[PDB]
């Protein structure tokens, strides 16, 4: 390799904890600690990054070819997230249970909506923003926080989805999850 | 016959195959 | 008196009773060989040579008997599936009975040498005291060993007078005892070349005969005699033990890694054959060659032999059993009775998934089904409440293309998950677990048991050699220096 | 084993009678 | 699981009875000593790769958590007029735990005192 | 498939009295 001197009295080149990523008509600041992973749950996923510590803390974007011109044409944002109640993962258990505690009858998972927004960045196209607390009957990570930023630019729906366990969310991964959320800009 | 397909055929089931560990520079 | 760990030292300066105790040990070993062979013949089931071979039945000395030529028994059967011709005197039971008769004769000779120990042959004519000319004894023994090595390599294994040795297919499909032509080139040093064994034994026998003649004719130097204590039997004990565990380490290594002297059809497959996808790669190559030229699926797989699919199965893995999982491999997970076929899995829209095979390190492994490209597409999840990978929502179907299941496609129930879990172990086989009341946990091969016993014995004999070399170099201080 | 045990017992009895015939104690007092 | 949840009472003040919902005992996220379970778990004999046939179905495949029901009879005694405080006795019949559905449940008879304040 | 209960019975009935008699004979011949 080429010979160059070591870094002495040369300061540090990265402290923000966020590295830019430019993709197919989208750009976002990924967490610097996180690393890429080739695990496509939904086939529409084009980019996926996950935490090296705990892979529940993960982020991915989907590039779904769509018909509706603008995100407002998907109706109310509630109507939009009702359509997207499939990328949360349906329960693989079908047995009867009234013993979960704090859940509906025969159910072992629940999702609570905590945010509904129509944020804008630079052009005028609106961004549907959502926060969802997903509580599973086992209580893993104390629940999972799903932050969704969705829009369509040309003819493809671009939906950010960062995941964070409630255990890590209370520790302080909220800053990085919200940083990815605000840095997802579709250009 | 298809050495590229059979190499990919044994790609998912077992990553430690000789056929994979040999000539892996070209892949 | 003597301590319990010293009672065998009474025959150090008694050559006749040393010969007696050597004869006693030799009788015990030959009697064990005969009795062990008869036990394995009594508990052996020769009905299915293909799907229930000897290494699946816990046979230990039968592969070693087979490797050098005996194949048929007095019961009229042969391990190759052929019905027996005339076995002569040298069948399995005949060799066992010969070992038992030899054991009795050696017992009688041991008794005679115990009683008649004060033979003038063991007395030095020059001084009158008891002594052994150990360099000359070594020369005689090396000459005899070289003669035996040359005879075994030039007459037995080459087939000019003997039967030969076991030569098999590279994938262990067809194998038999055949004469072997020696390989005198660099290929003769190929461990898997059967020709390197006659060439080795011929050359080593010639060289051993030459070295035995040299030791018969030439006396050692005084410096080397005093340095190695050649007048002492404890020094030759240490050196012999050293050579013995060297050979034990060598045989354990060749046992574990496989060689031409370690046939797959006799000692079972290898953990490196499982890890490196030997039988799996050959099976897939045969299926691809048949499918690319003519024969379609479900009939190309029928061309796959039953023995090869049995070799491609982690239950035949020697590195899968346990230390206290005792007994035959059949007692582990049943006697194999048939090959259900190649479990092929498809998605709901249609693409062939593959169950990730279990490595040897894992007592248990997660059941995942991943794509041709190398991306996880389905699994049998633990949590069963998340993502898009559970079987019941991916919608994979298993088709099967083999013997009992040739066109039976299962898509809806948990039988798909069960077949995926069976497919992570290799080729799915039908097992009878009621004949021997089988356990369920995998057992070890005779190859693994041989390797473990010989490596443990090799380290124990390393300690024994170190202790004996200590004792023979330090004889003056182990006995006494008398205030000086 | 089945026949091996019978053979072992028979040859053990034969060895015992052989030792009794040949390697007995010398007959003292008449 | 000693429950009186979802219990309706029909009858007079001297004696009124009814039925109540009895949950399983364990949730579907409960794992057995071998890690097998319902909603989460193994649902397979992981200890040995050659035993999942039609004999462990009671232990692996079913894993039932279906709720049962129990019958309790109540009685009102020692009524209070000024502040509406009733304290009678009860006798409750309900099934026991089926563990994980492996064996049938026994019937538990629970007798004791109950107390209430009326507003 | 080996009658090992009978094998154990025969082996013990051979070993125990033979060893007992041999020990008695050895201790008798050692001290005349
Ligand atoms: C190094 C020589 C060697 C090797 C490699 C084998 C290998 C094998 N033998 Mg074998 N055997 C041997 C010598 C050997 N044997 C000898 C010398 C005898 C005469 C006693 C026998 C008699 C014999 C019988 C009767 C049988 C076998 C069987 C078997 C097979 C089953 C696996 C097994 O052994 O169980 C497990 C092995 C172990 C658990 C090893 C024990 C580990 C350590 C040494 C124990 C420590 C001892 C401890 C201090 C004592 C306290 C215990 C106490 C509380 C009881 C296997 C391939 C079986 C078979 O398949 O039938 C053909 C069978 O039934 N063998
Ligand atoms: C140390 C090297 C070596 C070894 C391990 C073997 C091993 C073997 N040889 Mg062999 N051979 C060798 C060197 C060797 N050979 C050499 C140098 C030659 C050239 C002369 C031959 C030529 C040769 C021929 C022509 C044949 C064999 C055969 C065999 C196989 C069975 C015979 C046997 O040895 O049983 C074990 C033998 C003993 C343990 C000897 C014991 C002596 C007894 C106690 C005498 C008692 C008398 C009587 C036999 C007792 C009756 C027994 C019973 C019926 C009651 C066997 C695997 C035969 C074969 O092909 O297998 C089918 C065969 O026909 N060999
Ligand atoms: C007439 C003599 C004779 C014959 C023909 C046989 C024949 C046989 N024996 Mg055997 N045996 C004999 C005597 C004999 N034995 C005696 C006297 C004993 C008591 C010590 C034994 C104890 C015995 C046991 C425990 C076993 C056999 C077994 C066997 C069978 C397979 C042998 C095999 O493949 O192992 C391979 C043989 C070897 C690997 C020997 C290699 C010798 C080493 C490598 C020598 C290296 C050091 C050397 C000094 C270096 C020299 C220098 C060089 C330049 C010359 C075979 C039929 C096996 C069997 O299946 O049971 C029936 C078995 O396990 N025998
Ligand atoms: C362990 C001792 C040993 C012994 C006794 C032999 C013996 C033999 N070798 Mg061999 N060899 C050995 C080790 C040994 N080799 C090793 C470690 C290797 C490397 C893996 C080789 C690679 C080798 C090759 C490639 C060939 C032989 C060949 C031969 C045969 C004729 C060679 C010759 O001497 O003619 C006279 C030698 C010459 C005119 C010039 C020497 C150059 C040759 C090509 C190399 C072989 C030299 C060999 C090591 C000499 C061993 C000395 C021995 C005869 C005392 C002969 C019987 C030849 C053969 O297959 O026979 C048909 C052959 O082509 N050997
Ligand atoms: C041209 C004639 C000829 C031919 C064709 C051969 C052919 C062969 N010989 Mg050979 N040899 C010959 C002549 C010939 N020899 C002569 C004239 C002599 C002198 C008498 C020898 C002495 C000899 C020895 C001593 C050995 C061979 C071995 C071999 C085989 C090597 C391949 C193998 O089996 O695995 C590979 C074998 C090895 C890797 C062993 C190498 C030794 C290593 C370093 C041992 C390491 C263990 C040691 C205790 C270190 C500690 C390890 C630690 C972790 C504890 C091969 C088939 C080997 C054998 O017996 O095969 C099993 C062997 O050990 N030969
Ligand atoms: C062929 C190899 C060999 C031979 C010929 C000898 C020979 C001898 N050893 Mg030695 N030794 C060996 C290997 C060998 N050893 C090994 C491998 C080790 C490491 C474990 C030792 C460690 C050792 C020590 C520490 C000592 C000796 C001593 C002695 C001397 C007499 C003491 C004695 O045996 O009384 C009788 C021994 C017993 C009654 C032991 C009881 C039986 C044991 C506990 C179980 C036997 C297992 C089973 C029945 C046999 C299967 C083993 C086999 C498969 C290997 C004697 C000359 C002693 C000495 O130096 O002399 C003063 C001494 O203290 N040895
Ligand atoms: C823990 C290691 C060790 C130790 C401390 C000893 C110590 C002793 N051994 Mg011994 N030995 C050993 C290992 C050891 N040995 C091994 C592994 C073998 C092969 C099985 C032998 C075989 C052996 C024999 C045959 C004899 C002794 C004897 C003796 C005694 C006499 C002094 C002597 O010559 O030593 C031995 C000298 C060495 C161990 C030096 C080895 C240095 C090597 C050769 C350097 C080679 C490096 C080279 C680059 C290869 C590396 C390649 C790599 C990839 C493998 C002495 C107390 C003699 C005795 O009779 O006892 C009284 C005797 O005759 N030893
Ligand atoms: C008397 C003391 C006996 C102690 C050993 C008992 C073992 C338990 C047992 O019953 O096994 C019994 C098992 C047999 O076990 C039976 O096998 C049957 C088939 O024949 C069936 O499969 C049965 O299910 C099975 O229980 O194996 C043995 O007979 C013991 C073999 C002993 C030799 C094993 C190789 C180890 C060699 C060297 C390792 C040591 C090296 C030095 C030390 C380090
Ligand atoms: C099937 C074929 C036959 C089967 C083989 C049968 C083998 C028979 C003999 C085997 C047993 C040998 C008996 C040894 C008899 C014996 O040991 O005698 C004690 C002996 C002491 O010997 P001395 O030096 O006193 O010898 C002088 C004489 O008086 C004794 O002969 O110790 C040793 O030799 C080795 C040193 C430590 C050995 C003892 C320590 C053992 C550790 C135990 C730890 C317990 C607690 C652990 C808790 C963590
Ligand atoms: C006299 C005589 C005879 C013969 C007889 C007989 C029959 C013999 C035998 C014998 C035998 C039949 C033997 C066998 C044996 C056995 C052995 C010798 C063994 C052993 C052991 C061991 C060594 C072990 C070890 C161990 C242990 C301790 C446990 C387990 C594990 C191990 C391995 C570790 C006749 C009449 C013919 C003729 C001539 C004379
Ligand atoms: C008399 C004499 C003498 C002595 C000798 C000796 C001392 C011998 C020995 C020997 C021995 C030391 C032996 C041993 C052995 C062993 C055996 C014989 C065995 C076996 C086997 C079996 C049968 C077992 C089985 C089993 C198992 C495997 C496991 C499970 C359980 C059981 C236990 C059942 C002298 C030389 C001085 C002099 C001359 C003569």
TrEMBL record, chain C:
Principal location listed in the UniProt entry: membrane
Residues reported to bind chlorophyll a 1: 6, 8
Location in the cell: Membrane; Plastid, Chloroplast thylakoid membrane
Keyword NAD recorded: no
Binding positions for chlorophyll a 3 per the UniProt entry: 8, 467
SUPFAM superfamilies noted in UniProt: Photosystem II antenna protein-like (SSF161077)
Gene3D superfamilies for this protein: Photosystem II CP47 reaction center protein
Keywords, alphabetical: Chlorophyll, Chloroplast, Chromophore, Membrane, Photosynthesis, Photosystem II, Plastid, Thylakoid, Transmembrane, Transmembrane helix
GO cellular component annotations of the record: chloroplast thylakoid membrane; photosystem II
GO biological process: photosynthetic electron transport in photosystem II
Pfam families in UniProt: PSII
Mode of membrane association: Multi-pass membrane protein
Binding-site residues, chlorophyll a 6: 189, 200
Binding site for chlorophyll a 5: 67, 152, 200
Transmembrane segments: 19-39, 97-117, 138-161, 199-218, 239-258
Record-listed chlorophyll a 2 binding positions: 7-8, 467, 471
Molecular function GO terms recorded: chlorophyll binding
Binding site for chlorophyll a 4: 67
InterPro entries in the cross-refs: PS_antenna-like (IPR000932), PS_II_antenna-like_sf (IPR036001), PSII_PsbB (IPR017486)
Biological function: One of the components of the core complex of photosystem II (PSII). It binds chlorophyll and helps catalyze the primary light-induced photochemical processes of PSII. PSII is a light-driven water:plastoquinone oxidoreductase, using light energy to abstract electrons from H(2)O, generating O(2) and a proton gradient subsequently used for ATP formation.
NCBIfam families according to UniProt: PS_II_CP47
Family designation: Belongs to the PsbB/PsbC family. PsbB subfamily.
The protein's assembly and partners: PSII is composed of 1 copy each of membrane proteins PsbA, PsbB, PsbC, PsbD, PsbE, PsbF, PsbH, PsbI, PsbJ, PsbK, PsbL, PsbM, PsbT, PsbX, PsbY, PsbZ, Ycf12, at least 3 peripheral proteins of the oxygen-evolving complex and a large number of cofactors. It forms dimeric complexes.
Protein name: Photosystem II CP47 reaction center protein
Species of the source: Dunaliella salina (Green alga)
Lineage: Eukaryota, Viridiplantae, Chlorophyta, core chlorophytes, Chlorophyceae
From TrEMBL, chain D:
Compartments where found: Plastid, Chloroplast thylakoid membrane
Sorted UniProt keywords: Chloroplast, Membrane, Photosynthesis, Photosystem II, Plastid, Thylakoid, Transmembrane, Transmembrane helix
Membrane topology category: Single-pass membrane protein
A single GO cellular-component term on record: photosystem II reaction center
InterPro entries: PSII_PsbT (IPR001743), PSII_PsbT_sf (IPR037268)
Transmembrane parts of this sequence: 6-23
Pfam families to which the protein is assigned, alphabetical: PsbT
Keyword check for Cell division: no
Domain of life: Eukaryota
Keyword presence, Membrane: yes
GO terms under biological process: photosynthesis
Stated family: Belongs to the PsbT family.
Role of this protein: Found at the monomer-monomer interface of the photosystem II (PS II) dimer, plays a role in assembly and dimerization of PSII. PSII is a light-driven water plastoquinone oxidoreductase, using light energy to abstract electrons from H(2)O, generating a proton gradient subsequently used for ATP formation.
Subunit record text: PSII is composed of 1 copy each of membrane proteins PsbA, PsbB, PsbC, PsbD, PsbE, PsbF, PsbH, PsbI, PsbJ, PsbK, PsbL, PsbM, PsbT, PsbX, PsbY, PsbZ, Psb30/Ycf12, at least 3 peripheral proteins of the oxygen-evolving complex and a large number of cofactors. It forms dimeric complexes.
HAMAP family per UniProt: PSII_PsbT (MF_00808)
Protein name as annotated: Photosystem II reaction center protein T
Source organism (scientific name): Dunaliella salina (Green alga)
UniProtKB/TrEMBL annotation, chain F:
Membrane-topology descriptor: Single-pass membrane protein
Pfam families from the UniProt entry: PsbM
Major localisation: membrane
Domain of life: Eukaryota
UniProt keyword terms in alphabetical order: Chloroplast, Membrane, Photosynthesis, Photosystem II, Plastid, Reaction center, Thylakoid, Transmembrane, Transmembrane helix
GO CC, any one term: photosystem II
GO BP field: photosynthesis, light reaction
Quaternary state and interactors: PSII is composed of 1 copy each of membrane proteins PsbA, PsbB, PsbC, PsbD, PsbE, PsbF, PsbH, PsbI, PsbJ, PsbK, PsbL, PsbM, PsbT, PsbX, PsbY, PsbZ, Psb30/Ycf12, at least 3 peripheral proteins of the oxygen-evolving complex and a large number of cofactors. It forms dimeric complexes.
Purpose of the protein: One of the components of the core complex of photosystem II (PSII). PSII is a light-driven water:plastoquinone oxidoreductase that uses light energy to abstract electrons from H(2)O, generating O(2) and a proton gradient subsequently used for ATP formation. It consists of a core antenna complex that captures photons, and an electron transfer chain that converts photonic excitation into a charge separation. This subunit is found at the monomer-monomer interface.
Family to which the UniProt record says this protein belongs: Belongs to the PsbM family.
Protein name: Photosystem II reaction center protein M
Lineage of origin: Eukaryota, Viridiplantae, Chlorophyta, core chlorophytes, Chlorophyceae
């Amino acid at each position: 390799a080429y010979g160059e001197g070591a870094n002495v009295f040369g300061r540090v080149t990265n402290k923000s904890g966020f590295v830019p990523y430019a993709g197919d008509s989208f750009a976002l600041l990924l967490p610097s600690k996180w690393n890429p992973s080739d695990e496509k749950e939904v086939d529409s996923i084009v980019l996926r990054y996950a935490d090296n510590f705990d892979a529940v803390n993960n982020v991915y974007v989907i590039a779904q070819d769509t018909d509706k011109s603008s995100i407002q044409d998907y109706g109310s944002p509630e109507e939009f997230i009702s359509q997207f109640g499939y990328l949360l993962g349906r329960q693989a258990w079908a047995g009867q249970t009234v013993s979960e505690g704090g859940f509906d009858a025969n159910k072992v998972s629940s999702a609570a909506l905590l945010g509904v927004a129509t944020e804008k960045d630079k052009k005028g196209k609106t961004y549907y923003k959502f926060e969802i607390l997903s509580r599973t009957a086992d209580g893993n990570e104390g629940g999972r926080h799903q932050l969704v930023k969705a829009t369509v630019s040309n003819g493809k729906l671009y939906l950010l989805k960062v995941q964070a366990g409630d255990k890590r969310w209370f520790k302080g991964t909220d800053k990085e999850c919200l940083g990815v959320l605000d840095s997802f800009t579709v250009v | 016959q298809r050495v590229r397909t059979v190499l990919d055929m044994d790609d998912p089931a077992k990553e430690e195959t000789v056929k994979e560990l040999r000539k892996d520079i070209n892949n | 008196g003597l301590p319990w760990y010293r009672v065998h030292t009474v025959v150090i300066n008694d050559p006749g009773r040393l010969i007696s105790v050597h004869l006693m040990h030799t009788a015990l070993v030959a009697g064990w060989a005969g009795a062990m062979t008869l036990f394995e013949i009594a508990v052996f089931d020769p009905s299915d040579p293909v799907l229930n071979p000897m290494w699946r039945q816990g046979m230990f000395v039968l592969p070693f008997l087979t490797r050098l030529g005996v194949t048929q028994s007095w019961g009229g059967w042969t391990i190759s599936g052929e019905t027996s011709s005339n076995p002569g005197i040298w069948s399995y039971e005949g060799a066992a009975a010969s070992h038992i008769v030899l054991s009795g004769l050696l017992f009688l000779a041991s008794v005679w040498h115990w009683v008649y120990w004060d033979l003038e042959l063991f007395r030095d004519p020059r001084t009158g005291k008891t002594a052994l000319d150990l360099p000359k004894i070594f020369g005689i023994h090396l000459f005899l060993a070289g003669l035996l090595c040359f005879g075994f390599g030039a007459f037995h294994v080459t087939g000019v007078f003997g039967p030969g040795i076991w030569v098999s297919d590279p994938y262990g499909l067809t194998g038999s005892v055949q004469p072997v032509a020696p390989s005198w080139g660099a290929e003769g040093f190929d461990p898997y070349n059967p020709g390197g064994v006659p060439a080795h034994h011929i050359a080593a026998g010639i060289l051993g005969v030459l070295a035995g003649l040299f030791h018969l004719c030439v006396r050692p130097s005084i410096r080397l005699y005093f340095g190695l204590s050649m007048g002492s039997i404890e020094s030759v004990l240490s050196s012999s033990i050293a050579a013995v565990f060297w050979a034990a380490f060598v045989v354990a290594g060749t046992m574990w890694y496989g060689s031409a002297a370690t046939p797959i059809e006799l000692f079972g497959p290898t953990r490196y054959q499982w890890d490196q996808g030997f039988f799996q790669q050959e099976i897939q190559k045969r299926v691809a060659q048949s499918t690319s030229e003519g024969l379609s699926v479900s009939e190309a797989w029928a061309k796959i032999p039953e023995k090869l699919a049995f070799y491609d199965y982690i239950g035949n893995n020697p590195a899968k059993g346990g230390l206290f999982r005792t007994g035959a491999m059949n007692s582990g997970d049943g006697i194999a009775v048939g090959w259900l076929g190649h479990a092929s899995f498809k998605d709901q829209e249609g693409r062939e998934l593959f169950v990730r095979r279990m490595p040897t390190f894992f007592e248990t492994f997660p059941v995942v089904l991943i794509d041709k490209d190398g991306v996880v597409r389905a699994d049998v999840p633990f949590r069963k409440a998340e993502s898009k990978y559970s079987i019941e929502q991916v919608g994979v179907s298993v088709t099967f293309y083999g013997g009992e299941l040739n066109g039976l496609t299962f898509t809806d129930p948990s039988t798909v998950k069960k077949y995926a879990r069976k497919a992570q172990l290799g080729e799915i086989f039908e097992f009878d677990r009621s004949t021997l009341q089988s356990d369920g946990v995998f057992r070890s091969s005779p190859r693994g048991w041989f390797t473990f016993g010989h490596l443990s014995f090799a380290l124990l004999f390393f300690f024994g050699h170190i202790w004996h070399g200590s004792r023979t170099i330090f004889r003056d201080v182990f006995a006494g220096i008398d205030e000086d | 084993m089945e026949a091996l045990v019978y053979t072992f017992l028979l040859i053990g009895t034969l060895g015992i009678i052989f030792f009794s015939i040949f390697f007995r104690e010398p007959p003292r007092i008449a | 699981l000693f429950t009186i949840k979802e219990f309706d009472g029909k009858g007079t003040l001297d004696s009124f009875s009814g039925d109540f919902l009895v949950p399983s005992y364990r949730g579907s996220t409960f794992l057995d000593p071998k890690g097998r379970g319902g909603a989460t778990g193994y649902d397979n004999a992981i200890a040995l790769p050659a035993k999942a046939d039609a004999d462990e179905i009671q232990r692996l495949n079913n894993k039932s958590y279906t709720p049962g029901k129990g019958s309790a009879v109540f009685s009102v005694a020692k009524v209070d007029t000024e502040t509406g405080e009733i304290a009678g006795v009860f006798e409750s019949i309900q099934p026991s735990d089926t563990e994980m559905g492996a064996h049938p449940a026994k019937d538990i008879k629970i007798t004791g005192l109950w107390y209430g304040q009326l507003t | 498939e080996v009658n090992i209960l009978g094998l154990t019975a025969t082996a013990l009935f051979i070993i125990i009295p033979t060893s007992f008699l041999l020990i008695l004979y050895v201790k008798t011949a050692a001290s005349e």
